[PDB]
């Protein structure tokens, strides 16, 4: 049986504040700029539509040097940091971005038509953009976040997959890495392996995987380390209703309609797809720049940062403004020439993480050691190399950032005022 | 007229919230006669359909509508959870 950490984790009266200075990220909104011949990334892809997964490193409270150490017995017990307060500061002005594709697979406008559309020739793709669905979310836990998305499932050993055959789906659980993309209105799927077309969605998600937090799975998690607190806010509506060019993969059963004739003799593509639109963004609806007091967790792990680690996942599309900056090739002619100017796109993100940590102690009795050992043997081994080297996240080092004077920091003042004593 | 269910939102979600069936407005206060229980649901706030198309040929570097078979699929994900209270009836 699993038990609340409140059972075996003792709470001291010591609190420390820790915060990143001010994280900054600048890059191209849709794709990374690199040397054609090369593969080294010159400019990275930085979009408001990517997940930001911060791997927070905390100083080992056992190796740490406290002014007083009488508060615990280093022989019978050990120390762990407990996250009690978080403030995800965001810094750019609110605004909405926009993504498209020069060759988006969009046949005709099916929202309203005055006459039957012509006939699909070869490549009827259009240059089209859209404002993605709005999403604000924040996940906190001592284990990285887990997402779900639809990918291409493995086929059954029978009927040989005829070329062009529809690929099988499979919900795939994955680890959400820093830089991954969020569902933008086309659901959470792997567009690379499910769309040979390469033109069904805008460039920025076009050959990526849009993942959705698997909240269900994470909360079911027995120990609940992956996430002990979260805030989600997503909204979306249909801006336009389109058709997909291409060829019928699956025909419309004729028992569903009466054959036409002349123009209506041939059925138009009924492979409709809508254009998303996350409406207006607003201050009143902000999730960030507000402190989160992680006092009672719904999981058994009540904010204990086992391994002196801490994960903070964030997605904020309420500051997705992309800025176009163009340089002139010549500063002479007083006559505009498109060609005299090179147009570019850049997007900036501004973060500022702040935390309030509470020192905790664990008396290593038999039972406790058995439990903690079963739960995560590494805990004890590390007490008296990176297991997630495969994954990549925004590394954040706070080992030199802890301060006992909450007083001197904004999140600190807030915490004191909130907790009174 | 053509309908349109406007924007969908988290704040308006009905699910992923627990429902405590303590006082029923009917005479049957949540008794599951026959050890049966019916849970009817309708949720159009996750109706996203995803189009997936496979290429008939992986050669030509020139788009041809005829080279790709377009399809449509939709996925639904549920997870039902209940808390039951044992009851007795003196016959």
């Amino acid at each position, epitope marked *: 049986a699993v038990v609340s950490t409140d059972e075996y984790v003792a709470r001291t009266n010591i609190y420390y504040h820790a915060g990143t200075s001010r994280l900054l990220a600048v890059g191209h909104p849709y794709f990374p700029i690199k040397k054609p011949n090369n593969n080294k990334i010159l400019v990275p892809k930085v979009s408001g539509l990517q997940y930001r997964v911060f791997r927070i490193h905390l100083p080992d409270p056992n190796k740490f040097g406290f002014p007083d150490t009488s508060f615990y017995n280093p022989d019978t017990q050990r120390l762990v940091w407990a996250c009690v307060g978080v403030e995800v500061g965001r810094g750019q002005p609110l605004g909405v971005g926009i993504s498209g594709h020069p060759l988006l697979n969009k046949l005709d406008d099916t929202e309203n038509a005055s006459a039957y559309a012509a*006939n699909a020739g070869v490549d009827n793709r259009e240059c089209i953009s859209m404002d993605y669905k709005q999403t604000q979310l924040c996940l906190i836990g001592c284990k990285p976040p887990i997402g779900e998305h639809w990918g291409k499932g493995s086929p059954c050993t029978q009927v040989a997959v005829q070329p062009g055959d529809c690929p099988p789906l499979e919900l795939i659980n994955t680890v959400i890495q820093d830089g991954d993309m969020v569902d933008t209105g086309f659901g959470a799927m792997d567009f690379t392996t499910l769309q040979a077309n390469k033109s069904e969605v805008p460039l920025d998600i076009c050959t990526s995987i849009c993942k959705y937090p698997d909240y269900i799975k994470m909360v079911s998690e027995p120990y609940g380390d992956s996430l002990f607190f979260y805030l989600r806010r997503e909204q979306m509506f249909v801006r336009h209703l389109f058709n997909r060019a291409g*060829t019928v993969g699956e*025909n419309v059963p004729d028992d569903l309609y009466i*054959k036409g004739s002349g123009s*209506t003799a*041939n059925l138009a593509s009924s492979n409709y797809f809508p254009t998303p639109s996350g409406s207006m963004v607003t201050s009143d609806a902000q999730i960030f720049n507000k402190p989160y007091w992680l006092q009672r967790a719904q999981g058994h792990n009540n904010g204990i940062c086992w391994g002196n680690q801490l994960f903070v996942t964030v997605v904020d599309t309420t500051r997705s403004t992309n800025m176009s900056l163009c340089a002139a090739i010549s500063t002479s002619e007083t006559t505009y020439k498109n060609t005299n100017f090179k147009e570019y796109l850049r997007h900036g993100e501004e973060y500022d993480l702040q935390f309030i940590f509470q020192l905790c102690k664990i008396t290593l009795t038999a039972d406790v050691m058995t439990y903690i050992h079963s739960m995560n043997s590494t805990i004890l081994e590390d007490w008296n190399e990176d297991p997630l080297k495969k994954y990549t996240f925004w590394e954040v080092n706070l080992k030199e950032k802890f301060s006992a004077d909450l007083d001197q920091f904004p999140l600190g003042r807030k915490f004191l005022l909130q907790l009174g004593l | 007229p053509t309908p349109s269910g406007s924007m969908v939102t988290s704040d308006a979600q009905i699910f992923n919230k627990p429902y405590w069936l303590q006082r029923a407005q009917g005479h049957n206060n949540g008794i599951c006669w026959g050890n049966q229980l019916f849970v009817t649901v309708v949720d159009t706030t996750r109706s996203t359909n995803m189009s997936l198309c496979a290429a008939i040929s992986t050669s030509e570097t020139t788009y041809k509508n005829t080279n790709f078979k377009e399809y449509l699929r939709h996925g639904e994900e549920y997870d039902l959870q209940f808390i039951f209270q044992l009851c007795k009836i003196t016959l």
Partner: antibody
Amino acid sequence: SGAELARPGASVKLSCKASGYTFTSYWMQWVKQRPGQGLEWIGAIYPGDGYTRYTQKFKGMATLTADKSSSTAYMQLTSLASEDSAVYYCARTYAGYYVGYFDYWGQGTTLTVS
Amino acid sequence: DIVMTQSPSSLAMSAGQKVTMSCKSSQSLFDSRNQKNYLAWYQQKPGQSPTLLVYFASTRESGVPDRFIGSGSGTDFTLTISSVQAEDLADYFCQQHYSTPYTFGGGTKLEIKR
């Protein structure tokens, strides 16, 4: 496929091998021409998805199928009678769900029922 | 079904004469969708398979001699050979490609006088 002699009451299956194009993208027609007579439409098949269309006259007489891996279309004629003795052609109408012209014809297969 | 009537059923002309053949449809072949008349003309020379001459009523297939002219619309179509040559000896057929079933006209047999 080559000329064929079958007896009344029997069945025959003739083939049409495609070449020179992405077979699975194009619809195939089958057409009947009796000795000294005109052309009659039998039916059409879309190898890519297996869809068939038949002239009411030939429903129950002709069965169309195709084999993607060999780019070959087949037509089976059952319950044969002397009325079925004729030259049979296979032909391509161009790619799509539209109703196009017949742009390529096979050399034809002569069926004698006797 | 849409019935197609070709006339005349046979025509004998000497080399250099203008040949006119008519084709009727029971229903209009004009699709307002792309404003085309879905009519094709085919040429079947002795011992050969039909060859496409004209489609969309008046569009000549590449490789077909320019003496072949298709025209007309709706229910009345014409295939003209401006100056008939000896090699034009053939049966000529019209076929609608407007909705199903596809039906063929009865054919015109063009013979050469000399």
